[PDB]
Design a protein around this ligand. Structure first.
Ligand SMILES: COc1c(N2C[C@@H]3CCCN[C@@H]3C2)c(F)cc2c(=O)c(C(=O)O)cn(C3CC3)c12
Ligand SMILES: COc1c(N2C[C@@H]3CCCN[C@@H]3C2)c(F)cc2c(=O)c(C(=O)O)cn(C3CC3)c12
Ligand SMILES: [Mg+2]
Ligand SMILES: [Mg+2]
Ligand SMILES: [Mg+2]
Ligand SMILES: [Mg+2]
Lengths: 692, 711
DNA sequence: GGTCATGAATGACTATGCACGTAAAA
DNA sequence: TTTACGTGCATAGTCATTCATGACCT
């Protein structure tokens, strides 16, 4: 009956997204004829689930029990409500859930939208306040519509239902006599059921990819497609996929940038995690804080990140149990020194900047990597229509690669592979794939590679000291003892996890007699436990072109170098265009230092003395002021000859620079040197060796 | 051995056990909380040391019966883990050689060790007696003088280490969660370098005598008194240790947690929040900003504690229906009066400061408050706020410490500003006379205060007492319309209370209860009687004694006063004592602005002195090696005034900017005069403060909401 | 053909310290 | 008399399910 959680055509059920809007709407509603219900989290994709299974999922079950109908049942006779309304966020995840919702309907309750009982409530994206003359904007288009028409107006963005007070909620989406509200119409089944299948078919993701690259009342179909597209593109671009420059997803950059702006350089002390995350949401990334903090754990985990961006203090998980990390109220962290490579050149105008979600700040669109992080750190996420997996690589190995690629851009992949053989993982276990096939993986982006734990033999016990990337010692001990219980192995006596401060890993497997052929047991285990494991390779990522591509290893390096060339440039432009504007001021200054007396005369003698100084010395608006802002202490003969040498340095530094810009070839040497440098600073030897 | 049928309890599993089965080579660390769990589980030596999280504060078992003790799951696992039966000397099956209490080196950590000792002293004496109980002492600090580390258990040992000490960098271990495995290992776990006290239960009498005194839900009396009275290389006594430890806790939670200070009238979690909000510049005139950033900053730099706990104490200050005068203004879902705890999660909401809040904060940048080092000496925080008004009696506080608590009803601003303006002039005002001004509480509701005056005054002159409130209703036909509920009574609870009577045939005289409420009508509970002939007066003056439509309210004017000590204080007393605080605050402020005006006046002096012979000024700098001494000797002006001239921008050499700095001399000269009169003359000060109260009781004031009534 | 796991997105439950006065009962 | 309530500020692990996809698994 739904207790607690929860004429007849005058009635309307309000299905809102999440316990926030739950409380709010339940308030906002008109008690007489408006019932409320939170849909909590994303509901299951029902499009391929049997009406009978569909009710097994509780949050789904509850909707049926509420509307008083049944999945795959024409029996609308007990229908509890006149109008059923999908009350979602204004954001993407908002419309996604709605899409996931229409799906539960169109498929399992077609009858409903057929007779037209399904409505998508339309909450405002904005709220403007001219003097007191309120407006609401459902989107970007209407905002402009309203803006060219009026005191000066004051925007507020509605980043979602929970941050809207009930009074503005009722007026905009609840009370019928002001609520924007679409009557979604199914129409033909075939175009519909056809279109949504393409969309939510766990089997059909392939067409989706394409589709994207190709792509009052509204139609269920027209709408649930307009939405799901909005969704897809967002999670491809602005969530699950890295950009190539720095190799970072957005929550990833937003964290790392936020951490910079809280002054958390590696050289200093750590600061509570709550506050970093507290700032990340507060000003750049308004979503989960848990999600955030967890994405911030990964970056700080030695065993998950080949080159950590963050250095945590306290419990940040163990190699054995990554997810065992302590709550954010406990951990403190700062930045990794390796994160210098992503940030040190930020102040120096090397990056686009865009905004933040309320225009009150600006956040950088990418960071100025001094190295190609996307390959060293690598990534692993799932979007829509596509996903991405990218193996960590050795800094020094990849630097050589790029150094080579800079010099000779036609370098065969066969050659390149001689520089960057294979991923280099955070452990010492062996990467056991044939050269041939790794080269295939690299040249093709798609592929797969295997790792094998490392052992020796001692009597009737097998001694293991290295497990493969991301494999928990215990889970191995589990898998092993499972076969023992299943009695698939009658060969083993015990599995002792020795281990300590001295040996990070030390799993002893004890056979029966000093007569058994461990080789077989180990060879067997390899082919039945995680002591041997396979690893996905899908080099997808957003490229400089702003679009998602699956790229080669040589391609990725080539393209990156085009991004580093453009960066070092922006940067020299930056430094120069200051040295100029500055040498300019110096120039005019020691012009006054000649006739210093006149300047003082002109000042004491004149009302507006600025134009006098311009006419008299032939100096412009900008130099006139540098002089008027020259403290008396400066008139000293010392501090005079001092700003004459400062001209010397300045003017030489400038020549050195504009030569660098001028000459594509003396630039490459700069970038080649700046690679060779950091590979020295932050480089490390290989860990996971390569075998047969 | 054999294939038994009845089998023992599996083992807690949240126990991370050792592998070595020898009895004495073993040890169990009982660590406070899941973070310290994982970290200890890491630091420990797998072989002979097992680990087990205790999560939360375990129940106080000093009066729970051995049979009942295993009721409580968290207590169940300590018994199942050590393998021993409560109130039983049967140690013959005991799983570990040492039981080690490993808590935070904070106040709360010392409390969870006290409760733990109780559990043992009382239900496992045998164990404690055979000396199997131990207390690991994690260090509170790590000093890194050079390349050589030093650890200090507490403050005394930090004093010793640094005064013997090229610069020391100190680090506070705010608690185990944030230690790293290596550091934990070295300091608390690993035998050959760990500080580890053995606890002795050598004479039960003293001991159980003492623990009764602290841990018995009735002797709160003796605790209050006891408090006012007190303010393995080594072994200690369970009694020696738990007294030391329970006292630290009792002290801390009184002073630095539950009770408010008299000045601004806040508990620390509250003040730290509000300050943190100020420091984000979340001024009332400006836009709100995600709550998760406010709390993010609060635990980040001031209050090193739970974020939820903290966030929630923040919710309260935002709620129009619980704070008489909100200190925060909440945007988005912040609860309904009918479901106060229904508030959105913190990732959702944004909030800025109450306009009101300026009364606590406006005067902060102007040398009014003391400042103390935050918890890592990298920022400062105000010890109290410059409350312009007496917030403590306006908004009120409600809390429970140890050996005492504190309950304090909100009041009307205007009545209380009146009530003090009085006391400022007449410090002898009778309670009676003052009570004329401050008749009673003023709650965020329009329901009526139904306690006798004769009796409300006793509440005010003893600080202790009790007053009751009642809902406002009307009769229409055979239905009772209710519009005003008492302070903190939920419409729903009422409906529910009501239905329980119907449901148990105790009120067959009502056939329905409908809640009508809405935008235009805040509250309207309708009760639907049966016959129109029934006497609704009875119905209701029956309900008034069986639902919370008439509900009682606790008064206990306990707080920390200027003395830094807890007291219970008359309403009269409070305001008198508060005046002496605003006196001292206003003072402090005028000295601040003065001492800046003067320092400036001084600069202007030596300044227009140069304007005379400005040319000499220029030659002397152009002429000398270091011009400072010369200007000084030549113009007769000091090191300070010399620099000033030396930092005189050329634009100031214009005739305009000269006459200009003349005026400014005149301006200031007057201002400072007004100010020193005010300092100099006690009665002109009162006049000032008198004035500022009137201003504020105009600017942020309001009329009474809950009326006073007789029944 | 059917499961699994991967990291980013969409927070309410639950037990307990403490004082101590109201309320319902033995 | 006694036992069950409420109160705020302290001490987080658990739960479902999107989306893409290759390898177990059983
Ligand atoms: C886990 O302990 C808590 C419980 N209980 C649930 C647990 C189940 C196991 C045994 N009982 C405990 C008590 C609870 F109900 C609430 C909170 C809680 O709100 C909180 C916080 O920071 O807000 C922190 N904690 C823990 C960090 C102390 C809570
Ligand atoms: C209760 O919602 C969540 C569930 N449960 C909710 C669903 C219905 C009731 C319980 N069963 C499922 C799982 C869950 F398992 C995980 C998370 C979660 O991780 C999360 C976050 O912010 O990180 C937020 N939430 C809340 C925003 C919903 C989660
Ligand atoms: Mg949202
Ligand atoms: Mg989560
Ligand atoms: Mg603690
Ligand atoms: Mg809590």
């Amino acid at each position: 009956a739904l207790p607690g959680k929860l004429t007849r055509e005058e009635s309307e059920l309000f299905i809102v997204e999440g316990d926030s809007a739950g409380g709010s709407a339940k308030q906002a509603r008109d008690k007489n004829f408006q019932a409320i219900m939170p849909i909590r989290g994303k509901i299951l994709n029902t499009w391929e689930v049997s009406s009978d299974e569909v009710l097994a999922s509780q949050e789904v079950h509850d909707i049926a029990i509420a509307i008083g109908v049944d999945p795959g049942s024409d029996d609308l006779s007990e229908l509890r409500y006149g109008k059923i309304c999908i009350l979602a966020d204004a954001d993407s995840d908002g419309l996604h859930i709605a899409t996931l919702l229409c799906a539960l309907f169109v498929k399992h309750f077609p009858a409903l939208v057929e007779e037209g009982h399904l409505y998508v409530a339309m909450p405002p994206l904005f709220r403007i306040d001219i003097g007191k003359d309120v407006h609401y904007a459902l989107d970007d288009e209407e905002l402009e519509t309203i803006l060219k028409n009026v005191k000066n107006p004051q925007i507020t963005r509605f980043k979602g239902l929970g941050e809207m007070n009930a009074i503005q909620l009722r007026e905009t989406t609840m009370d019928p006599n002001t609520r924007r509200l679409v009557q979604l119409d199914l129409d033909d089944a075939h175009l519909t059921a056809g279109l949504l299948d393409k969309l939510l078919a766990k089997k059909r993701a392939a067409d989706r990819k394409q589709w994207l690259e190709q792509k009052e009342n509204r139609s269920v179909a027209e709408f649930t497609e307009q939405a799901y597209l909005n969704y897809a593109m967002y999670v491809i671009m602005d969530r699950a996929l890295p950009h190539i420059s720095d190799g970072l997803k957005p929550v990833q950059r937003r964290i790392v940038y936020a951490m910079s702006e809280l002054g958390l350089k590696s050289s200093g002390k750590p600061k509570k995690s709550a506050r970093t995350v507290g700032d990340v949401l507060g000003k750049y990334h308004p979503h989960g804080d848990s999600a955030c903090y967890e994405a911030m754990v990964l970056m700080a985990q030695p065993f998950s990140y080949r080159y950590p961006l963050i250095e945590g203090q306290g419990n940040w998980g163990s190699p054995d149990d990554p997810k065992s990390f302590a709550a954010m109220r406990y951990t403190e962290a700062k930045l990794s020194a390796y994160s210098e490579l992503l940030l040190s050149e930020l102040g120096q105008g090397t990056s686009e900047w865009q905004d933040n979600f309320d225009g009150s700040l600006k956040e950088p669109i990418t960071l100025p990597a001094r190295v190609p992080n996307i390959l060293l750190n690598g990534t692993t996420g799932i979007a829509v229509g596509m996903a991405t997996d990218i193996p960590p690589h050795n800094l020094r190995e990849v630097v050589k690669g790029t150094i080579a690629l800079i010099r000779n851009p036609q370098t065969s992949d066969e050659k390149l592979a001689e520089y960057i053989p294979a991923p280099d993982l955070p452990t010492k276990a062996e990467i056991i794939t044939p050269p041939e096939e790794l080269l295939k993986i690299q040249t093709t982006g798609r592929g797969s590679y295997r790792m094998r734990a490392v052992y020796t033999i001692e009597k009737n016990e097998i001694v293991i000291t290295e497990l493969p990337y991301q494999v928990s010692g215990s889970k191995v001990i589990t898998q092993i003892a499972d076969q023992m219980q299943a009695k698939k192995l009658p060969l083993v006596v015990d599995v002792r996890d020795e281990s300590d401060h001295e040996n990070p890993t030390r799993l002893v497997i004890v056979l029966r007699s000093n007569r058994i052929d461990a080789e077989a047991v180990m060879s067997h285990l390899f082919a039945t436990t995680d002591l041997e494991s396979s690893y996905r390779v899908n080099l997808n990522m957003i490229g400089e072109d702003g679009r998602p591509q699956v790229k080669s290893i040589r391609r990725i390096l080539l393209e990156w170098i085009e991004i580093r060339k453009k960066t070092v440039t922006r940067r020299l432009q930056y430094h120069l265009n200051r040295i100029e504007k500055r040498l300019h001021i110096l120039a005019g200054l020691l012009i006054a230092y000649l006739d210093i007396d006149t300047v003082i005369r002109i000042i004491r003698e004149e009302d507006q003395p600025k134009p006098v100084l311009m006419e008299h010395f032939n100096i412009d608006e900008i130099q006139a002021e540098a002089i008027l802002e020259l403290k008396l202490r400066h008139l000293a003969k010392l501090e005079e000859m001092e700003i004459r040498h400062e001209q010397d340095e300045l003017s030489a530094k400038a020549a050195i620079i504009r030569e660098q810009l001028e000459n594509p070839e003396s630039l490459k040497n700069l970038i080649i040197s700046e690679l060779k440098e950091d590979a020295k600073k932050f480089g490390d030897e290989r860990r996971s060796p390569i075998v047969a």
